[PDB]
Symmetry: D2
Subunit: 246 residues, 4 copies
Amino acid sequence: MLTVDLSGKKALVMGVTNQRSLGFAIAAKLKEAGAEVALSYQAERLRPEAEKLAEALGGALLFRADVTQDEELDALFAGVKEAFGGLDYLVHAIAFAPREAMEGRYIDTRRQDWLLALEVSAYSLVAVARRAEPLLREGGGIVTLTYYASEKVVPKYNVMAIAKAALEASVRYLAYELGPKGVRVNAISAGPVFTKMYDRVAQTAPLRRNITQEEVGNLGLFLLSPLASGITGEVVYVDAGYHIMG
Amino acid sequence: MLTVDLSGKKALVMGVTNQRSLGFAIAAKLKEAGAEVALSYQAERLRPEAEKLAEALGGALLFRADVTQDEELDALFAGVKEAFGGLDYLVHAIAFAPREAMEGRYIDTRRQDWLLALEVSAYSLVAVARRAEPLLREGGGIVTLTYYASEKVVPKYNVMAIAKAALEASVRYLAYELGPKGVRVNAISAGPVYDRVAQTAPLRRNITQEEVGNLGLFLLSPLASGITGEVVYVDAGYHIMGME
Amino acid sequence: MLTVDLSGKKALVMGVTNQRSLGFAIAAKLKEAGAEVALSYQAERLRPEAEKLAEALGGALLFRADVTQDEELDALFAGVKEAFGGLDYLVHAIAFAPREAMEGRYIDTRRQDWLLALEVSAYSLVAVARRAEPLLREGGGIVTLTYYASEKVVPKYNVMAIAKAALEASVRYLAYELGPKGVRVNAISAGPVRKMYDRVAQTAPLRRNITQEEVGNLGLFLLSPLASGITGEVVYVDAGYHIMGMEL
Amino acid sequence: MLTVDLSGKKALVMGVTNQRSLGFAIAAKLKEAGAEVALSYQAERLRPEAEKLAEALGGALLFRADVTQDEELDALFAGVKEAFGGLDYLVHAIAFAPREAMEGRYIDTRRQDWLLALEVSAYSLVAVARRAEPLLREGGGIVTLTYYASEKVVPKYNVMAIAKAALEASVRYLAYELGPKGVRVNAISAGPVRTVAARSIPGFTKMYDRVAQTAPLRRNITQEEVGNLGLFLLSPLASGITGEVVYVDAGYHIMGM
């Protein structure tokens, strides 16, 4: 049998606020594999919520940081450097779009809402990748989350679809720029884990079912682990084959 | 023989600052096909340059407006509605990224610069599309410019590549939202208008701005009435190559 | 006002057997534009049908040739060379898959049926492009038809989907090899032309199906000098249907 | 730590003729994970070579079968069924194009050569998938190999690029048709690797140097990296993945200028 032993490896998981999320599933698999995890949380008032996530994982180091504040991101990574000495994996599970932008039509998106969605959902990957670069050890990597709406029109996804398109293009450019130092950058396009798409996916996908957060966690583990050492700049789909359907 | 007659059609061309540009090329072809053109210009201090452009087109209305200012965009379309009564075509040739963003690596892009690039290069399509919607007549259309860097890594294009990815995704969503009312939205992915491109491209030469202008005219004309949400490449076939 | 004048231009249109074909729509637009057209017909027993098509176009030269027979393709282009002196456009509207292959599942396609579909639907472009190469003048081009099932799974299309995937990849490699001499090669991915039609209309951004004229116009454009900078491209004329990630 | 234990799993690996091949690499990782492997070999005169391969894998059943012969493929699967009772994985590493087709221009490909390339390289996936269907258990899967040339033009790959385009479309359709029964179908798009198969592609050496100098990782991948991706896709870790073409090419394909 094969064994994936990530003991000694260090991971920073961002944008997670609940145990029922893609970001937490990846963190859980990373911990199961033996890696030590650090979780960022947006504001001090969210510390207790983060603490519960840390406990659910069986232990994790916490750091406060709002991804829209460069000063706080600097603090976060100085903190990660001091506590871990370096970094191996970075899980980017940050995503946000104002409610106003998500209600209605994409064409009606307000300037401020559009920019905030792009800033938090796409630019944040750039912001953290740059600060993680000095800490990332050879064989390390960054993995983010995306969705099919980035390439095809999925009604009611609006600016998030555009943000994910920006995120995926960012993944390619970051893979190119961080690749020479042995750091890989990939995106995971997950299927649904609303009821509109969710139910239709189970009916139309080749596997005739929706994926689970564990299946995303498993792909995240694979992509970050040395087993995926030759894979970078990729957008890998774990959607039960839904996206290949016409 | 066949003819494309755009007599009576009205076009708003934005982002044009030079005669040697893709946006101008499209405006020129629309004019040749018989349509009337209105050119937007960014600041009043650029009025003289704008007037030279209008004159080079054989006449064009001019409207001042900076796409980062919603109030100016409102004024732009109020003026277009008053002068034209309606609108048939909108040519979005707006593209910009702060110099600092284009210098160095993409990973080093500063927050403010990154957002300004996306705001001017991608969101602007949304901003103008929303304002053009009420004015656009049936058979109307919106065309924008893009580059293949949106899908493949082209070193040094940096944030502009990401902006184009956002632009192309916006084209698809806008095609979906404006299509029911008969408005088409498409993007033109043009090659450079360098020597490496000529050596690698199937046609072994670079495209000309006229070739981009012709594709723009086609997409906007009723000849392409069944086409929307597309990114059409006019690059002498360069992007199909997996090497060189 | 702009004008497209293809008088003096020569086009060979293949795979057309009816006025409702996309190939006929393109031929009609080319003729309307001023070009002279040549139509191939598979066998003498189909000569009557070809003659009606020629008449429907307002006049056209006919040539017999089955695309699975190299000698007949050799005779076709020898005939085209003699009657036209050269060639400007080649419209490949050939498509076929044995009914057995189209009934049931793709996984159950029989060996001979699978190969015949690929041979007629994809290899034929290579075969005709090779023979047209010596005749195609600068600024000339080849355009073929395809469907999005080549990239997305459209049940029931079965082997034709795979054939179209092969056709599109062939279009790219041919664009690469014929491009240095001024020949353009592109594909047109058309949507359905009219229950099934209602579904497409409901999901397509334009909320309607495309017309055969819309395919004809894209074919005219791509072959015309207006598209001189375009090659190796697969252009969709489907009312935006394929951009939708979910049926409406 | 985590473990991928495939003990009791049965795999049929086809198209392998040398230890320096992507197909062998996947079979090796499968064996290392605990799976039992059966290798097909094209002709009885290659039995000695096949035996050396089996030995190198630490043991593996051998079955003679040429993918262009339906009766032989029937006997192959009848044999696999008799020996394994069922099947979990099918690795399709079969690829072939006549030398004449590969030498010269794609536009000059002869009819018979073109059809043979497509028949062996693409149709074979369909032929073996159909026969494997009744033998494949839930959680089962089929994985095949492909490369960038299928989507973008790489000089000198000629008909193989076309065959891979057909192979990839076949993967999507087979994923759709076998998915209901819990069987997954995926393709691995590998970057250049010094293999016996690569020698048969005139446009390989060109690609090989290019990748190392142009890919984000600034190096070529190894067959082991392809082997690992194959193991992953076939294992339960990839249970939600199907109809996908996964690139393991050091990021080369995302590059433009």
